[PDB]
RNA sequence: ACUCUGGUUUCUCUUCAGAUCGCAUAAAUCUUUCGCACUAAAGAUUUCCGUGGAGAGGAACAACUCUGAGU
């Protein structure tokens, strides 16, 4: 945004609040049913395909049960 | 609310917290469409619009929806046809207007100054016989036909 | 638009010479307006209007 | 157009902003006699297509019609006929005087 | 043949609406398809242009033509 920064006051945030709940009215048209459709496109979406660091997560949690003496014992491929 | 007198956009108009006029700026482009979708017809001079100002007069829209009769609307531009060959046919040397109106940094021209006092030239309404167009002529070429007649439409 | 109409309320140009001229103006304004060049899609509307114009 | 059309059954047994169409976009070029010279529409000579001039439709219509009417209207039909036609005649002539260079 | 509701106009809010919600017609995004995608099709979503139905509220002037009911 150009303005991003600027003179903002009292009346600014009044004027900002103002159109911020014109734009809601505004999506109030179709916001339930536009929510809902996703809502269900992004839960399908993340169940089909899941992110590399959702399906790691199992196996990083498992991992948290390690001693610190163990850390130390971590060999080189020298072997 | 109710409607003000026209001077008052007008001076606000004239004479001109940013973010108030930041956030009416946001809306150009519904003040072009209603602009352009209230534009006036062949056979109308002046056409009066209910007009939604901003205080700043940083946008106005025109806030009007262009109903009209389909039958009535598609008699008027039939009419406007034919008249449009009579005059096509009539004049041979025809001139179009210059493309690009005004200079390409003229100042606008302010309303008040010279449009406000001059009267339109003429319309382009056909002539209508009153022996046969006798239940049409008294309002076949107003702004809006018979919005104030209760027997014809449903009201205003 | 508001040129024209402006143009025809001073009286220099006839109520005929606006209509026409805004025939032309909504006929071309690929050529009077740079539009195409921003909105590919644009392109086929202005086609559509040339299309009119042939059509009337 | 023959050829058109034996090989019309041998087919089917076997960047730049362009503002105005291509004239290969062109549809409408047949072989058949029957789709090219489409005998257009005579609405009981009394009906006309939009748009196009009266009086060009009138110069330019079948006049079959009007044999018909010439052949089976009666004597005084045919003066009704001839009374109307002049007095519309004579309104539009009286148009034609106004409107005049 | 005598009584009694339901009035019309306009403004605003809420909700439903697959109804040609619209006898009109745009934009964006994603996927798919063959080209090599303004000059291209398919599928889907969404946003705008603005409607209909029902309800509620406001104010404007009409109160029994009609719809009927009670006779």
């Known amino acids: 945004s150009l303005f991003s920064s ?52 199992d196996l990083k ?3 948290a049960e390690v001693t610190e003496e163990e850390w130390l014992s971590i060999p080189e491929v020298g072997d | 609310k109710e409607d003000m007198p026209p001077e008052h956009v007008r001076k606000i108009i004239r004479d001109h917290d940013k973010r108030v006029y930041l956030g009416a700026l946001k809306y150009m482009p519904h003040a072009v469409l209603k602009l352009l ?51 096509k046919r009539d004049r041979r040397h025809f001139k179009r207007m210059r493309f690009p109106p005004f200079d390409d940094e003229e100042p606008p021209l ?7 006092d001059v009267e339109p030239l003429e319309a382009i309404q056909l002539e209508l016989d009153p022996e046969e167009d006798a239940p ?3 309002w076949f070429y107003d702004h809006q036909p018979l919005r104030d007649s209760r027997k014809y439409v449903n009201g205003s | 638009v508001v040129d024209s109409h402006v143009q025809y309320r001073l009286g220099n140009v006839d109520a005929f010479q606006l209509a026409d ?36 | ?41 005579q609405l009981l000579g009394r009906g006309f297509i939009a748009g196009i001039d009266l009086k060009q439709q009138k110069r330019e219509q079948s006049r079959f019609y009007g044999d018909l009417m010439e052949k089976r209207r009666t004597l005084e039909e045919k003066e009704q006929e001839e009374a109307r036609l002049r007095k519309l005649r004579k309104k539009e002539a009286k148009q034609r005087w106004d409107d005049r260079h």
């Open chain 1, 61 to 63: 949690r498992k991992l």
């Open chain 1, 6 to 57: 600027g003179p903002y006051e009292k009346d600014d945030e009044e004027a900002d609040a103002i159109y911020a709940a014109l734009d809601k009215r505004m999506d109030e048209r179709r916001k339930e049913r536009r929510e809902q459709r996703e809502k269900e496109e992004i839960e399908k979406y993340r169940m089909e395909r899941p992110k590399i660091q959702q399906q790691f997560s």
């Open chain 3, 21 to 56: 001229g805004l025939q032309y103006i909504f006929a071309h304004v690929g050529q009077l307006t740079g539009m195409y060049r921003y909105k590919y899609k644009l392109m086929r509307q202005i086609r559509m209007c040339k299309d009119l114009k042939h059509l009337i």
């Open chain 2, 37 to 87: 979708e209230n534009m006036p017809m062949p056979w109308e001079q002046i056409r009066d619009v209910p007009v939604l100002y901003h205080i700043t007069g940083a946008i106005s829209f025109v806030n009007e929806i262009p109903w009209v009769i389909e039958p009535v609307y598609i008699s008027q531009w039939g009419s406007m046809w034919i008249m449009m060959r009579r005059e």
């Open chain 4, 1 to 41: 157009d023959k050829s058109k059309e034996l090989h019309a059954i041998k087919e089917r047994y076997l960047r730049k902003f362009v503002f105005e169409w291509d004239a290969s976009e062109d549809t409408s070029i047949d072989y058949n006699p029957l789709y090219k010279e489409r005998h257009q529409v």
């Open chain 2, 136 to 138: 049409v002529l008294d």
């Open chain 2, 110 to 116: 302010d309303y008040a100054d010279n449009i406000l």
